[PDB]
Design a protein around this nucleic acid. Structure first.
Ligand SMILES: [Sr+2]
Ligand SMILES: [Sr+2]
Ligand SMILES: [Sr+2]
Ligand SMILES: [Sr+2]
Ligand SMILES: [Sr+2]
Ligand SMILES: [Sr+2]
Ligand SMILES: [Sr+2]
Ligand SMILES: [Sr+2]
Ligand SMILES: [Sr+2]
Ligand SMILES: [Sr+2]
Ligand SMILES: [Sr+2]
Ligand SMILES: [Sr+2]
Ligand SMILES: [Sr+2]
Ligand SMILES: [Sr+2]
Ligand SMILES: [Sr+2]
Ligand SMILES: [Sr+2]
Ligand SMILES: [Sr+2]
Ligand SMILES: [Sr+2]
Ligand SMILES: [Sr+2]
Ligand SMILES: [Sr+2]
Ligand SMILES: [Sr+2]
Ligand SMILES: [Sr+2]
Ligand SMILES: [Sr+2]
Ligand SMILES: [Sr+2]
Ligand SMILES: [Sr+2]
Ligand SMILES: [Sr+2]
Ligand SMILES: [Sr+2]
Ligand SMILES: [Sr+2]
Ligand SMILES: [Sr+2]
Ligand SMILES: [Sr+2]
Ligand SMILES: [Sr+2]
Ligand SMILES: [Sr+2]
Ligand SMILES: [Sr+2]
Ligand SMILES: [Sr+2]
Ligand SMILES: [Sr+2]
Ligand SMILES: [Sr+2]
Length: 81
RNA sequence: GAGUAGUUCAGUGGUAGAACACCACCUUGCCAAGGUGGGGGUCGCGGGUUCGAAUCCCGUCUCGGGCGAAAGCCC
RNA sequence: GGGUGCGAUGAGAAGAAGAGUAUUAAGGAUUUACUAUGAUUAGCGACUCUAGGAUAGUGAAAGCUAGAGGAUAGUAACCUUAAGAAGGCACUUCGAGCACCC
């Protein structure tokens, strides 16, 4: 969802970033873009799978990272509550 | 008057020079830079002159320019 | 504040390599190449010798081409010592602006 990423306090941007923060385990939820290359998106849902955290799925990796504040759009972004 | 190496330029009768680019090694993470080495040229083309022609001479092609009624002519 | 180019497919910083390398110096060492020079006097023009070429004049010997052989330095290649770097991609954390222009 985009209201929830717009939302909140502590969020996480870029995919190397979600992945690194995934092995920390202090993320509450993680949201990802379907238009993205599945080469990377693979690598965020495998372990957001294994861990147990809810994964949701996005249309465009572009309005995602307008939601984030960035003026560029992101392929993976995590709300680390 | 312009014409010479990929390009930009020199070269004012003694076999064609520089930069830059291209090749090779340095140099296996991949480049760039660098430092060495090497390659490459009917001097637009054909004559003539000369021991020798990028050089001077005549013809010829292209291109700029100018004189001209043109044909032509000059740089 | 304006105009562009790029950025979570990673802006930008730092670390880490790079590397005790390239290299500048002080030596050591005396072979390989690279280049530079070859008394005077003729001569525009000469390290020596060989073969071809080709030769008008000057010359003891001439400009091309292909080889081979000589000393003087200057060089880069091997050693020692003291000094000795660096830009980008890629690595490694932090993670959003950086670059050109008025
Ligand atoms: Sr921006
Ligand atoms: Sr030309
Ligand atoms: Sr000229
Ligand atoms: Sr190479
Ligand atoms: Sr180079
Ligand atoms: Sr060279
Ligand atoms: Sr050369
Ligand atoms: Sr050369
Ligand atoms: Sr050719
Ligand atoms: Sr001829
Ligand atoms: Sr002749
Ligand atoms: Sr001729
Ligand atoms: Sr004319
Ligand atoms: Sr007229
Ligand atoms: Sr992109
Ligand atoms: Sr960077
Ligand atoms: Sr750095
Ligand atoms: Sr360093
Ligand atoms: Sr490194
Ligand atoms: Sr290395
Ligand atoms: Sr070290
Ligand atoms: Sr004298
Ligand atoms: Sr003399
Ligand atoms: Sr002399
Ligand atoms: Sr000789
Ligand atoms: Sr011989
Ligand atoms: Sr002979
Ligand atoms: Sr004679
Ligand atoms: Sr003679
Ligand atoms: Sr020779
Ligand atoms: Sr010497
Ligand atoms: Sr050394
Ligand atoms: Sr790589
Ligand atoms: Sr800078
Ligand atoms: Sr102004
Ligand atoms: Sr102004």
């Amino acid at each position: 969802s985009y209201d929830k990423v717009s939302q909140a306090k502590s969020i996480i941007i870029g995919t190397k970033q979600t992945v690194k923060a995934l092995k920390r385990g202090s993320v509450k939820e993680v949201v990802v873009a379907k238009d993205a290359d599945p080469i990377l998106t693979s690598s965020v849902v495998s372990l957001a799978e294994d861990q147990g955290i809810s994964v949701s799925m996005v249309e465009s990796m572009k309005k995602l990272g307008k939601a984030c504040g960035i003026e560029v759009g992101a392929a993976a972004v995590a709300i680390i509550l």
